[PDB]
Amino acid sequence: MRECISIHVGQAGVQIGNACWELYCLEHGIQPDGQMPSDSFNTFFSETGAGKHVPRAVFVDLEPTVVDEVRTGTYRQLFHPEQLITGKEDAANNYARGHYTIGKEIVDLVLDRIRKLADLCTGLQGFLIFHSFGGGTGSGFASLLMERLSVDYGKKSKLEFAIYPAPQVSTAVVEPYNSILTTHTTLEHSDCAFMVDNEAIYDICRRNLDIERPTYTNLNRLIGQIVSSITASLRFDGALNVDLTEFQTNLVPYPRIHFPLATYAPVISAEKAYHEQLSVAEITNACFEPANQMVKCDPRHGKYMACCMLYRGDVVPKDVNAAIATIKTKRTIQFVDWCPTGFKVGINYQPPTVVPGGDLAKVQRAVCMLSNTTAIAEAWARLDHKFDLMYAKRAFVHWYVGEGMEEGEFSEAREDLAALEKDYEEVGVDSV
Amino acid sequence: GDKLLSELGYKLGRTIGEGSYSKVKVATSKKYKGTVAIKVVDRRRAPPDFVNKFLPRELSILRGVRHPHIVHVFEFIEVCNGKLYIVMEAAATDLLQAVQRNGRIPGSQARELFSQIAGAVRYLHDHHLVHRDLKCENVLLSPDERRVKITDFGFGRQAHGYPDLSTTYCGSAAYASPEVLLGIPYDPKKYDVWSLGVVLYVMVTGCMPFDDSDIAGLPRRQKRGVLYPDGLELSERCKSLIAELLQFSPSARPSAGQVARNGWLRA
Amino acid sequence: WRCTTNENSYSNRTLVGNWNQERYDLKNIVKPKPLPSQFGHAFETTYDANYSRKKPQSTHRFKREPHWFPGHQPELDPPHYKCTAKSTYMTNYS
Amino acid sequence: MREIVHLQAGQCGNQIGAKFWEVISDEHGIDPTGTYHGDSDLQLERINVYYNEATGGKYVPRAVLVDLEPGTMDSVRSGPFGQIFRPDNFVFGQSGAGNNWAKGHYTEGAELVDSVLDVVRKEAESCDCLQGFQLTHSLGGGTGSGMGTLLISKIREEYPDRIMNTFSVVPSPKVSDTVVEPYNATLSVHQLVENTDETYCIDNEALYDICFRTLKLTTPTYGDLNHLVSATMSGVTTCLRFPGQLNADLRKLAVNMVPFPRLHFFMPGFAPLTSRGSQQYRALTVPELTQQMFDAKNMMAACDPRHGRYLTVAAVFRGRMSMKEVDEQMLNVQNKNSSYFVEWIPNNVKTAVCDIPPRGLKMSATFIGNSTAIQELFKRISEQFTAMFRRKAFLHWYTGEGMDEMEFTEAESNMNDLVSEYQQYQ
Numbered sequence A: 001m002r003e004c005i006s007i008h009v010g011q012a013g014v015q016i017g018n019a020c021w022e023l024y025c026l027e028h029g030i031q032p033d034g035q036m037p038s039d040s041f042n043t044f045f046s047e048t049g050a051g052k053h054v055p056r057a058v059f060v061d062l063e064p065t066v067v068d069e070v071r072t073g074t075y076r077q078l079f080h081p082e083q084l085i086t087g088k089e090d091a092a093n094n095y096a097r098g099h100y101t102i103g104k105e106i107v108d109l110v111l112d113r114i115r116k117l118a119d120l121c122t123g124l125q126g127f128l129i130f131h132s133f134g135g136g137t138g139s140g141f142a143s144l145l146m147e148r149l150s151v152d153y154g155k156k157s158k159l160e161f162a163i164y165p166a167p168q169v170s171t172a173v174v175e176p177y178n179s180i181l182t183t184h185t186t187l188e189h190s191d192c193a194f195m196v197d198n199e200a201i202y203d204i205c206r207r208n209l210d211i212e213r214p215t216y217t218n219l220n221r222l223i224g225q226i227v228s229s230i231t232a233s234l235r236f237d238g239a240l241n242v243d244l245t246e247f248q249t250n251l252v253p254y255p256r257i258h259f260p261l262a263t264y265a266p267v268i269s270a271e272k273a274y275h276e277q278l279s280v281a282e283i284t285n286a287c288f289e290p291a292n293q294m295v296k297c298d299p300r301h302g303k304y305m306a307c308c309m310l311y312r313g314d315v316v317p318k319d320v321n322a323a324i325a326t327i328k329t330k331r332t333i334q335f336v337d338w339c340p341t342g343f344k345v346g347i348n349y350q351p352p353t354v355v356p357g358g359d360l361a362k363v364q365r366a367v368c369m370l371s372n373t374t375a376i377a378e379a380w381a382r383l384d385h386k387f388d389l390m391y392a393k394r395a396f397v398h399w400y401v402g403e404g405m406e407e408g409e410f411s412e413a414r415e416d417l418a419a420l421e422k423d424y425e426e427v428g429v430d431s432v
Numbered sequence B: 001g002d003k004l005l006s007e008l009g010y011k012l013g014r015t016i017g018e019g020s021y022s023k024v025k026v027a028t029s030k031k032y033k034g035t036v037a038i039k040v041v042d043r044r045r046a047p048p049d050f051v052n053k054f055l056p057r058e059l060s061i062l063r064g065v066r067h068p069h070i071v072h073v074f075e076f077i078e079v080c081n082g083k084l085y086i087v088m089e090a091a092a093t094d095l096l097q098a099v100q101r102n103g104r105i106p107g108s109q110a111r112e113l114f115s116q117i118a119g120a121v122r123y124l125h126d127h128h129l130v131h132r133d134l135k136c137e138n139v140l141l142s143p144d145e146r147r148v149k150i151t152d153f154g155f156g157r158q159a160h161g162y163p164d165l166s167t168t169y170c171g172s173a174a175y176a177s178p179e180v181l182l183g184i185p186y187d188p189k190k191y192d193v194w195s196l197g198v199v200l201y202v203m204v205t206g207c208m209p210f211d212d213s214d215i216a217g218l219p220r221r222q223k224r225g226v227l228y229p230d231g232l233e234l235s236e237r238c239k240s241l242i243a244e245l246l247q248f249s250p251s252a253r254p255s256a257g258q259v260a261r262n263g264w265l266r267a
Numbered sequence C: 001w002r003c004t005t006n007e008n009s010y011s012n013r014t015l016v017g018n019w020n021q022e023r024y025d026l027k028n029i030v031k032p033k034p035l036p037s038q039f040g041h042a043f044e045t046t047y048d049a050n051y052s053r054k055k056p057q058s059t060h061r062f063k064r065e066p067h068w069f070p071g072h073q074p075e076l077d078p079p080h081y082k083c084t085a086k087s088t089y090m091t092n093y094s
Numbered sequence D: 001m002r003e004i005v006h007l008q009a010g011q012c013g014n015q016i017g018a019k020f021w022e023v024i025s026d027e028h029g030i031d032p033t034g035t036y037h038g039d040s041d042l043q044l045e046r047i048n049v050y051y052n053e054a055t056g057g058k059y060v061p062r063a064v065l066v067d068l069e070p071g072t073m074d075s076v077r078s079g080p081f082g083q084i085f086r087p088d089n090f091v092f093g094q095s096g097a098g099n100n101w102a103k104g105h106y107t108e109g110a111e112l113v114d115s116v117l118d119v120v121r122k123e124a125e126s127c128d129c130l131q132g133f134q135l136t137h138s139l140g141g142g143t144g145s146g147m148g149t150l151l152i153s154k155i156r157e158e159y160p161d162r163i164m165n166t167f168s169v170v171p172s173p174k175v176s177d178t179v180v181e182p183y184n185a186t187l188s189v190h191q192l193v194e195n196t197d198e199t200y201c202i203d204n205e206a207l208y209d210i211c212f213r214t215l216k217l218t219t220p221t222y223g224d225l226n227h228l229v230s231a232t233m234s235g236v237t238t239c240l241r242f243p244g245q246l247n248a249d250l251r252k253l254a255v256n257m258v259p260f261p262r263l264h265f266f267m268p269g270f271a272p273l274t275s276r277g278s279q280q281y282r283a284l285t286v287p288e289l290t291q292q293m294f295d296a297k298n299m300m301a302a303c304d305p306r307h308g309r310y311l312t313v314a315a316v317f318r319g320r321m322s323m324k325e326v327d328e329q330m331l332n333v334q335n336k337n338s339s340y341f342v343e344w345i346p347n348n349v350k351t352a353v354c355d356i357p358p359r360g361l362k363m364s365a366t367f368i369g370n371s372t373a374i375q376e377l378f379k380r381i382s383e384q385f386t387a388m389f390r391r392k393a394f395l396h397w398y399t400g401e402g403m404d405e406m407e408f409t410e411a412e413s414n415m416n417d418l419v420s421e422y423q424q425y426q
């Protein structure tokens, strides 16, 4: 039976893990100590001999403090001390440290824990891996465990949630480096990746939910809502259940184009939801708006390639089909010449669950959208621009050189990203 | 390139205000039932200056502020392959072309157009925003040449107060200031305040005062004292006004408050 | 430029120099003040009675706290958020 | 786990060191005796970093108190937190250096280093995982400028991987308390540039500018200027000691700071500095912190950054706050004064967040800055050394320790080269 494994890496990964597992335990009714008071949870939560449920998660970080917070938190007895793995020294925003010196001592134990938990799993559906490209840990360690995980299990789907660096705001000076040097792993070793930036969520929180001071927990809660909406088809029954492999095969047409886009609807506060009627046409017209994109890219400058819609709640296929047609017969939303059929609707039953202390208003229906489209290439091109402006002066190179990366890999990775943007253009080329 | 615009009936033609990455092509429309001027921006071919670090600044000024004698754009839309057009209102002629039609404009109608454009310049500076680009080619008039509308809001900045001074030196030498060209920090309001001086001067004199041929000698000349072409008759309060708009001291020139209310313009 | 020549530099009661900054200090606000006795009727202004009120005030001691910035006054702060705060995880995820 | 070894040298060093152990003590709420008297559990969770466990619920500093002149160690033990420093870590010389860098670095340094090297190795083997070393001293002393710079040479060989940062006191132009100031400075920074991962040049004249203008203090005693340095030290590692929304450490900031190995000189700063009257018209908001931050009067060193171009900037925030109003405002300060950051690096500013604020204060932050303006200091000291070396004045004290004259030439050789390459990046 279908099984998920969560492989969260770095501080961003473990905080997303806190959010998502809090949402999952509340959704299934699991107490923080770990018992249902009163088998959809067997995708994530496995029984013990004492009648208590444990999650299929591994949180790894090369600094101990953030995970020690969870070890001392209210969920101290929900996770295992074994699935929480810490490092005495961290990468400190250095892909070389994250990939060749500190990752070597611990990739074996990480693989051991993953192997044990996969052995616990009977039918393993796949891997969801949560990390960030800016962080040295979340880039280098994730890349090396990616390299080893593919050769340990070639056939299992390896889906990536990752925090893309935002176009104007960043939290480092040397993050474009690690962003570039993780693209090799994320290109040759990922079947589909879900880069998000925090700036678009900041705009969404200012823009829809009226909250004028969100902290990291609010963006983390939105990402947790995204992943729950993704996996709702596995977890609960529905009319059109869409597991991982369906939407991955119908979102990836070419091996080197596996970079779709997340979108959620509806995102609105209680005060605003009390006055606004919500329908399938409402939420899908909200989905097809550039102002609601979780990345700073305008798809009016890009060519839609494949859209996967996940409806959830009191949804009716009539409303879905009328929605899809009232998306198709509009000139502002364009579709590529070789993709006349371009939509992937899956239907679930269970309406979204609102967490206390949350921000999202309780709604009866929701929709998630995963759109492969070509407008994303401009972000890689901007990252190329900043990488070239750094490499021309050869800044910060000595750290990597002394840690044990050869400098020609920098030029190789620049060439790789150039090839990727070139073949994105090649796919955008018309088929007449 | 133009397929999305062709679906909306936007077959433009009539190239006015030609440029590498900006044109003023007259268009035809079906929704607005008439003609619109189209301004193109090439987001990839053009340099980053326009494309990044200044692009939202220009477009936000083209989004929010409303006034009778300013730009009033209808919408911004674009064809997919990485371009940028601008759907702007009806336009007739900028001021330099109309100047050359007769050589100059007599003072009676001139103070009429100047009171209109000085009246417009009041409104820009009250809203904590600056233009830093005023030029006869960007002073777009009416078909009957009785109204003014400045355009090319390309150097906007959220200017607030004196304690912070602008460091960016952006300006064409024909309508420039030494504090732009002599490399000293300046008050953003005062640089625009002088942009009226050359605009008023060129429109009536028929020639700009100094010589935009040498970058270095122009400030040294500019302290000689501004001189008007011989045979041209103006008003004494306007002889003053040009002298208090082209003087070397930064803040000795009148600000927007006094440039608003002048004796000759009120007359 | 260390603008300090030969100058006044005497007691703050005269109210000269940075006397105001001297009054705004812990020792000055814990200094007691006698209550007026015989005489004092002559030494009075219009503002003393017409536009202001004067009453006797009780002086108190202070609590000891870990001062950070040399002119710290943690005594005269509101009696909350003075204790150790909590992590955002402990205030959101409980 | 991330342990840290507290090194000291110089009379300046010991008093700042004594005041720093005052500041991080109440943070962990540890009394003069040695017992924890705080309240919150988090406040005693991370005590292993600076303190070492002792029997009876007692904690002792990971301290190394060294000075050649024995007079000052009498003052430290007699302070308020005097009887917390372990007497074995009071390794002391028998005579002074007389403001001579030569005697402290070669002659009288050579005997006391072994005892200093004894205690620091025991401290190194006490901890499982040391983050790195740090030392406070004066480049204008005889011991700290001397023996301390001898110490920092030896540990780099013994522990190359460990980070060193020196909160180091730089001479001032007008407040000049010694005539042999340049020779020690020119002979100690030459040791810094080769063996230092990050430098903090703190100036006592600039500290006098804070009290006179920002806080309006009429009688600034040394215990005040020593507090501000101690405030900077705790603000560097507050994200290390406590959980945060986006955690960081000495390593994350150091990698985020050194573009080329010769440029590791920084200007520190402290955010919430208000006079006694200023509490009445104020509202604690992140806008009020950042405006105070980048304004040049706030700076802890003797150079206007307006005359230079900022290369890299780090701000370690402390307390409970939202992210974007920081994030918008470091974007805001980037965009507006675009002339003063370099153009070949985008996003020059680094941000770190710690949840726990300083005690009795709602919100605070610490600013570490790399800019071109630090070169304006090094040309000034080079100006004043050469005018005295060119007459070979005062020289016989230094040549009386057997040292040659080429090292004088070689020391100035690096400084002129250092300002040469530093000018190229403007």
Ligand SMILES: Nc1nc2c(ncn2[C@@H]2O[C@H](COP(=O)(O)OP(=O)(O)OP(=O)(O)O)[C@@H](O)[C@H]2O)c(=O)[nH]1
Pocket: A009, A010, A011, A012, A013, A015, A016, A061, A062, A063, A090, A091, A092, A093, A094, A132, A134, A135, A136, A137, A138, A139, A163, A170, A171, A172, A198, A216, A217, A219, A220, D245, D246, D247, D252
């Ligand atoms: N959206 C979101 N992003 C986060 C969160 N926490 C960290 N990040 C991102 O993570 C990036 C830095 O990586 P970190 O996780 O902090 O550090 P790391 O990945 O462990 O790598 P090292 O610093 O070397 O240990 C920042 O740029 C943030 O954008 C979070 O809670 N939410």
Ligand SMILES: Nc1nc2c(ncn2[C@@H]2O[C@H](COP(=O)(O)OP(=O)(O)O)[C@@H](O)[C@H]2O)c(=O)[nH]1
Pocket: D009, D010, D011, D012, D015, D016, D067, D069, D097, D099, D138, D140, D141, D142, D143, D144, D145, D177, D204, D222, D223, D225, D226
């Ligand atoms: N800021 C500050 N500086 C101090 C303090 N005590 C001494 N100094 C400085 O230290 C310098 C002299 O250092 P010195 O005692 O010779 O160091 P040593 O020879 O290594 O012991 C003087 O220039 C003082 O300015 C202090 O408490 N605070």
Ligand SMILES: [Mg+2]
Pocket: A010, A011, A063, A090, A092, A135, A136, A137
């Ligand atoms: Mg990290």
